[PDB]
Design an enzyme around this catalytic site. Structure first.
Site, PDB file in Angstrom:
ATOM      1  N   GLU A 171      48.286  31.728  49.058  1.00 37.80           N
ATOM      2  CA  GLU A 171      47.030  31.043  49.287  1.00 37.80           C
ATOM      3  C   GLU A 171      46.702  30.121  48.138  1.00 37.80           C
ATOM      4  O   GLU A 171      47.310  30.176  47.068  1.00 37.80           O
ATOM      5  CB  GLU A 171      45.870  32.042  49.471  1.00 37.80           C
ATOM      6  CG  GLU A 171      45.848  33.196  48.459  1.00 37.80           C
ATOM      7  CD  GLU A 171      45.833  32.720  47.009  1.00 37.80           C
ATOM      8  OE1 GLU A 171      44.901  31.981  46.624  1.00 37.80           O
ATOM      9  OE2 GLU A 171      46.756  33.087  46.254  1.00 37.80           O
ATOM     10  N   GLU A 314      49.353  31.786  44.967  1.00 38.14           N
ATOM     11  CA  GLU A 314      50.104  30.710  45.617  1.00 38.14           C
ATOM     12  C   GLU A 314      51.328  31.206  46.359  1.00 38.14           C
ATOM     13  O   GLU A 314      51.997  30.428  47.040  1.00 38.14           O
ATOM     14  CB  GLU A 314      50.580  29.661  44.605  1.00 38.14           C
ATOM     15  CG  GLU A 314      49.520  29.074  43.713  1.00 38.14           C
ATOM     16  CD  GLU A 314      50.108  28.000  42.808  1.00 38.14           C
ATOM     17  OE1 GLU A 314      51.356  27.846  42.804  1.00 38.14           O
ATOM     18  OE2 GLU A 314      49.335  27.318  42.108  1.00 38.14           O
TER      19      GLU A 314
END
Lengths: 340, 340
Positions: A171, A314
């Site tokens: 994310e 991430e």
């Protein structure tokens, strides 16, 4: 969506038994390769892998979105960073891009709600320009959550048709550790103080406000812990919903998904609440340095392989663990047998 | 050998400062990549890496030898397995071979004392056909230990001239968890019961005898904890000495060495006792499932990256961690900067 959840396959016990027998006969003391052996057997039972632990193409799906709760001063990073980092993702300069390239995986950047103009090169699945501020109301409507779940789920299983057999989730979204903490608090029944962390270097003198924001979100929305979709739509965010969708989609597809850090653990708690059948397909990667990591992992009954004190997110942790999955497969297929 | 120890270089603080500054400016919240950042800085300070975190060729050195203490019934695996597995190592069918191939590393199998005829393809550095039974006397003479240390050290730094920049250490030798436990007991001052494990699936009803063997070895030989060579020659083994030698050699060469499991932790305790300057060059890989792992790691002040509940040995853990070292380098060199 009810059809999707209903059609998630159960693990193939027959393939798992064949796998265990084969591993026991390899050139080594029985059970000496520890979790590598259990990982291989777990993989063998996933229907999309065709009865044997194997890895074809790999992909990391990074869900990007902005949060209205950013206005509550729960994040030191300016809001714009979401859009900037998303664009950098397409340039291959971020942490997850570098680690994915090392693992031979492709990164798919998906915008599910960034508060900025569309970014060329990014997969567009935006629900809105940022979700609602959870401190004063819900993040989104139940219908918006269900629609995004189905859309992401379909995108995920569609990649499976392109040869992808291993997914990683990630994310990108300023202020997202706040809704993640709220969700973990609701699903585990733990007090907010016990699960609220510093996120992206948040000063210790600003934590109290973060804990208060989390409690208000819960008090005002009153999400029902037994309804994962209710929790995601009330105190989650578009990125969190997106990650949950990759998990449901991979499971429906009978394929493994590697988790990342704290944000992904909150999404996994929601996915397992929505459909317990998703659990067998989830693989942990690392043990996040975020404060509520231990609690989340305990309720998922997961023990990460990597202790890297990482908190970047991430999907970097997921990418770092891909070689471990390939290692379990290589052991299974390439080791010699005690027989000979 | 005294010259070798004296010439081990100290870490380059200047290169480390340059490295830290560069990492702080990468496209991410400062310190968000946790241990990956500290690993990159650690690598930058190693003189053999030319001032920057980087990985060229990789090699795993597997030290093989037999132990006289095998006669005390401390191992369920027949003695012959050492020679059989050593030969399999040359065929590429073992666990470390498969995981090394996954990491793009070459495996060097070194015989430092197998009790069998020489095996073609294996590097020959044998001291004798198995070391002495530590339960009734010393494993070897001090001169034999010093000679093997120098020979292995030179072989190790010589590979550095061939382009190798990252080493992994491993062992192969039936009954070797016994001398490893004895060494850990002596160096840490812990009672034998606290560090004696099941090794290669040793039945729980046979542990008591193993603990007794360890105590007798220590009582009869009276190794001096402040003299690492004294401990290795008295209650160690040829394989343990060999692993210690890779560590001293890599350090002299200014290059990093990845540890494996419990056997390697005991060798690292000895190497650090012999020369504290070796410490900066050691990198942990995984957290061994062997009982005395926690104690050994505490005295080395090391926190492994991988939690795989592994206990196979052979250097498999070290190979599995090589991608993590390459990941820290990729992050350092390929990530974008916040400046732009």
């Amino acid at each position: 969506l009810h059809a999707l959840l209903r059609d998630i396959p159960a693990p193939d016990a027959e393939a798992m038994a064949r796998t265990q027998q084969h591993i026991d006969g390899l050139l080594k003391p029985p059970g000496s390769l520890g979790r590598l052996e259990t990982l291989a057997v777990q993989l063998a039972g996933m229907p999309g892998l065709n009865g044997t632990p194997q890895v074809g193409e790999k992909a990391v799906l990074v869900m990007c979105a902005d949060h209205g709760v950013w206005d509550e001063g729960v994040a030191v990073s300016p809001k714009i960073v979401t859009a900037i980092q998303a664009a950098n993702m397409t340039r291959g300069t971020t942490g997850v891009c570098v680690l994915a390239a090392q693992a031979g995986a492709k990164v798919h950047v998906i915008d599910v709600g960034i508060d900025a103009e569309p970014i060329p090169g990014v997969v567009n699945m935006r629900v809105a320009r940022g979700c609602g501020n959870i401190a004063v109301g819900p993040a989104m409507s139940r219908l918006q959550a269900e629609a995004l779940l189905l859309e992401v789920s379909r995108y995920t299983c569609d990649l499976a048709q392109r040869g992808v057999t291993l997914f990683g989730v990630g994310e990108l979204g300023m202020a997202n550790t706040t809704p993640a903490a709220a969700m973990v608090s609701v699903f585990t029944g733990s007090d907010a103080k016990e699960v609220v962390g510093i996120g992206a270097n948040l000063p210790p003198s600003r934590i109290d406000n973060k804990v208060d924001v989390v409690r208000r979100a819960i008090a005002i929305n009153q999400p029902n812990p037994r309804d994962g979709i209710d929790v995601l739509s009330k105190v989650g965010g578009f990125d969190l919903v997106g990650m949950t969708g990759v998990m449901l989609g991979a499971a429906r597809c009978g394929l493994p998904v590697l988790l990342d850090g704290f944000l992904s653990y909150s999404a996994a708690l929601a996915a397992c609440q929505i459909a317990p059948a998703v659990r067998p397909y989830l693989i942990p990667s690392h043990f996040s340095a975020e404060k509520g990591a231990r609690i989340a992992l305990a309720h998922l009954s997961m023990e990460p392989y990597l202790h890297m004190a990482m908190r970047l997110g991430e999907g970097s942790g997921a990418a770092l663990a891909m070689p471990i999955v390939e290692a379990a497969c290589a052991m299974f297929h390439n080791m010699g047998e005690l027989a000979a």
